Design a protein around this ligand. Structure first.
Ligand code: NA
Ligand code: NA
Ligand code: NA
Ligand code: NA
Lengths: 81, 377, 84, 376
């Protein structure tokens, strides 16, 4: 009873966090797709795409890489919890 | 509190006049204009920015340009021509065109005014989110050339969106009101409204006497605008990429889409600077696109189109039985009027006359409508 | 161009800081629970109800629970480090 | 219309509906809310959240406001109590005020302002449950409160944006909860035995044709469940010294964890003759394990448990009644759950049955809710 109860209170904090991880990921995907040369599989933040297409070449590459790394860290954090 | 809505072909804008100041309302993403886009998916109906963000993944179920169908017969030559540039389906329901899409797994068709009604709904909601009150009264604008049925259909679209349309006013009249041209002193004043947006060009001559407006003439090109200037750039760079790398990107939609976006950005930059860099990370087969363009080269690519904007000006003057020297005020509306060369051509045509342009050209119509809405309620 | 890089960075920053704030709330929640299991002076709040529930568990369960919290806080901290 | 039991350590709010009373739970599902208020560098906290941060912010966490409400600073009771509170009490034109640090600002508040905050939380709890805005309420106070304390309590309700329909006596509310005012017969007597977490009150009421009259009151304002917990704590601190040669008495965290373990053990001993206590790394990494029987628990509290009978005898004398003249005995307060307490009172009254079917922590609120429905 107690163990089950203590575990349930912890699982709710975790679940809520996993949901937030999910939100961050979907938001990051719309920004990453604006940088990709692939046909967008999901929504593309049109404003962000305009802005990045406007940056200098290497800054476009940096932004894409930063976004890729963030998505990887979000996934690593997801699987580790 | 009554609002003013600019129901545009490509984007819409809503504003409100309170405490002696017009306020152009930003949407949930902070944008002062909202795309007149409506999309249908397996689970929902998106409108505005969210609808436009997913056009690439859901092209055939994302509707836009509905305004171009208002008051049209399915078999009109312009509808058949426009249909070729639209990914979505248009069908003939007893002589009237209807956009057809898939929604929640079901086939649905909508009349053009119903799509407009959806956009008005979005604009209504944007206004309410800002005012924190229920928005019911509004003034909606329409092109000056709209006939009775077109105006009535727009009004009905507003009524169905839950709006009490106080009045349907002409876009150029709204622009003239934004600049307070109807509050000036004297005898008749002749006003020319030069409206060059993303996909349309309209010229209107209005006469104003004691606050009363009369449309004297209208002219323009329903298929001329900023997008065509970007188009000239896109084709120019596709040929340049082909010449330099021996690679034709024309069949890679994503590549063309990114290049088009780059050209649009470059075009805007050329309205403020004399040169722009155009760079795209791994445009095709990992090959970076790296070039530049001067304002002069941009003008040259569009020369015939820029100079061509004066023909409708001359036609409107001729039809209004006026000599260019009889125009008292010139108003610029539409994002493309920002182009220096266009302004210079227009100013020279009118012997150096100063142009009314201090008000953001993308927002002038909403601005004038907001002002008139406060007066009407 | 330099302004574009700045505006682009801001947009990503807002998405990140938003997530980092969601990661901060989870950390505080877990921290109020962990402190309910710890014999150290609490740096912040201490969930009293959770402290009762824990003390009501078998000795080894109390150790389990505390161990699970130290792990989550560590994984949550690794996440904060990597994602800046 | 809701009924609120504004207790010294915890408060409870109920509402009459469907012919029955419903005791409303708060956000955390607790049917009672600590009468605490905390002031931090950023915010103000009320209830559980306030109690959860007591350890990190002791000097700015207020409680026992009820012990000051309506009293003068120079009151012998105030002067005595402020020597045991971790927060500051200052003099303001003869009026007592609590002084705390709130947002880097040294501020002070009147006892009734602190209570209005507790009432506000209770108001918000009731609103969340009913869905409507709650404004009408009946609030309770100890039968021994004077006009000054009652008025200050009403004002606290007023400040909280409530329309206090009436200020009624806690014991009277308990008697109403058991409908001891609706029956046949003539003028009868009632003894309310109220033992909470830190206060003990004995009240004798006489009910005649639906009319209540307080005949006498007695008790100990500093005797409650916490004292029985202290006796156990001291017991285990000495036990630990013997088994591990270590004294934990000067380790706040250790003492608090032990106290929490003792509270649970006490609850268990209310339905079991034995209880087990386990605490991971209680002191210097050493695990604490032990047990305690009901008999030993009773021996540890012997003087405190039997002492509760003295105020009963005093109340009887002041009412000029023999114990055989008591018609009903009512149990209120969480601690009346302790078997030994119930047995001592029952034996004192020669086996007379005790009224206790109503959750002792909610009876007062229950009765006030009933009265609220009648005055609404
Ligand atoms: Na533990
Ligand atoms: Na008092
Ligand atoms: Na007072
Ligand atoms: Na509630």
């Amino acid at each position: 009873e107690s163990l089950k109860h203590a575990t349930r209170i912890i699982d709710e904090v975790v679940s809520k966090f996993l949901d937030d991880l999910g939100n961050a990921k979907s938001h990051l995907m719309s920004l990453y797709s604006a940088c990709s040369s692939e046909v967008p599989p999901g929504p593309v933040d049109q404003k962000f795409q305009s802005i990045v297409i406007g940056c200098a070449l290497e800054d476009q590459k940096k932004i894409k890489r930063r976004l890729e790394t963030l998505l990887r860290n979000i996934d690593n954090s997801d699987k580790a919890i | 509190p009554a609002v003013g809505i600019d129901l545009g072909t490509t984007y819409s804008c809503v504003g409100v006049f309170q405490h002696g100041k017009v306020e152009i309302i930003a949407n949930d993403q902070g944008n002062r204009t909202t795309p007149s886009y409506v999309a249908f998916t397996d689970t929902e109906r998106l409108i505005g920015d969210a609808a436009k963000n997913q056009v690439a993944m859901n092209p055939t179920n994302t509707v836009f340009d509905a305004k171009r169908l208002i008051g049209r017969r399915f078999d009109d030559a312009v509808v058949q021509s426009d249909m070729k540039h639209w990914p979505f389906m248009v069908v003939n329901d007893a002589g009237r065109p209807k956009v057809q899409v898939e929604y929640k797994g079901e086939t649905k068709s909508f009349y053009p005014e119903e799509v407009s009604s959806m956009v008005l709904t979005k604009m209504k909601e944007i206004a309410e989110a800002y005012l924190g009150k229920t928005v019911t009264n509004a003034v909606v604008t329409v092109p000056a050339y709209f006939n009775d049925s077109q105006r009535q259909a727009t009004k009905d679209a507003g009524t169905i969106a839950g709006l009490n349309v106080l009045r349907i006013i002409n876009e150029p009249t709204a622009a003239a009101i934004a600049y307070g041209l109807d509050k000036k002193v004297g005898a008749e004043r002749n006003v020319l409204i030069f409206d060059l947006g993303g996909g349309t060009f309209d010229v209107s001559i209005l006469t104003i006497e004691d606050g009363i407006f009369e449309v004297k003439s209208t002219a323009g090109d329903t298929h001329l605008g900023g997008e065509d200037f970007d188009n000239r750039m896109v084709n120019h760079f596709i040929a340049e990429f082909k010449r330099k790398h021996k690679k034709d990107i024309s069949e890679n939609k994503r590549a063309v889409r990114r290049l088009r976006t780059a050209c649009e950005r470059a075009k805007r930059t050329l309205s403020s600077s004399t040169q722009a860099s155009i760079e795209i990370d791994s445009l095709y087969e990992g090959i970076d696109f790296y070039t530049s363009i001067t304002r002069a080269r941009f003008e040259e690519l569009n020369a015939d189109l820029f100079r061509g904007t004066l023909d409708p000006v001359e036609k409107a003057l001729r039809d209004a039985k006026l000599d260019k020297s009889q125009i008292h005020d010139i108003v610029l509306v539409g994002g493309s009027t920002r182009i220096p060369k266009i302004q210079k051509l227009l100013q020279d045509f009118f012997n150096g006359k100063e142009l009314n342009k201090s008000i953001n050209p993308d927002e002038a119509v909403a601005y004038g409508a907001a002002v008139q809405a406060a007066i009407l309620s």
